[PDB]
Amino acid sequence: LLDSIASNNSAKRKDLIKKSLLQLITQSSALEQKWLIRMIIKDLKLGVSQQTIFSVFHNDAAELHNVTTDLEKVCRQLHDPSVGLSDISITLFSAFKPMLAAIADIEHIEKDMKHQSFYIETKLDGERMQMHKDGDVYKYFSRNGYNYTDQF
């Protein structure tokens, strides 16, 4: 039902969205409808961190989610708790969580660089993107893993 509603919103159709929501309402209880509303809004407020959920799911799941950024692969590969992954590293056509930068104090900057020469670069204002190229197959991914390939 959620897939139908999302695709149908993407297709510029509202009568079908109304039908799907009506079916969900008619075939749900008050608590189920409340939870469904929370998932639609994309907030649950469970009080438990996503990192905790991933850790309980498998020993090495946060790293795999960072490298891949797709709940399907993490859920599929990490099924048997005993069986782990030998080596996890960036792979083609799979979004990876970008590496960010933290505030720095000009006074102790040299100390933060272990008293060694460093690189100074200009700050760029705009979107953060990553490009995957294999032959003439191109994929573009945004900061959080959304696919912007259609635009570019």
Ligand X SMILES: Nc1ncnc2c1ncn2[C@@H]1O[C@H](COP(=O)(O)O)[C@@H](O)[C@H]1O
Partner DNA sequence: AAAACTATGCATGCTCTACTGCTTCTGATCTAGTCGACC
Of residues 103-132, those binding ligand X (CB under 6 A): 121, 123-125, 128
Q: Which amino acid is at 21?
A: L
DSSP E strands in the chain: the ranges are: 130-134, 137-141
State the Cα torsion 84-73-20-12 to the nearest 10°. 160
34 binds DNA (CB under 7 A): no
- Interface with DNA, residue 142, by CB under 7 A: yes
Cβ of 108: how many Cβ atoms within 10 Å?
9
Per partner kind, with CB cut-offs from 5 to 8 A, the member of ligand X, DNA, none near residue 71 is none
Task: Please check whether residue 67 is in contact with residue 88, taking contact to mean a CB–CB distance below 8 angstroms.
Answer: yes
Tell me the one-letter amino acid at 38: R
For 92: left if phi > 0, alpha if psi spans -120 to 50, otherwise beta; the answer is beta
Q: Select from 62-70, 83-91, 121-129, 130-138 the region that touches DNA (CB under 7 A).
A: 121-129
Taking CB under 7 A as the rule, does residue 50 contact DNA? no
The least distance separating DNA from the CB of residue 91, rounded to whole angstroms, comes to 20
User: Is 123 assigned a catalytic role?
Assistant: yes
Which residues does the annotation mark as catalytic?
Answer: 123
Residues that bind ligand X (CB under 6 A): 100-101, 121, 123-125, 128
Residues that bind DNA (CB under 7 A): 126-128, 142-146
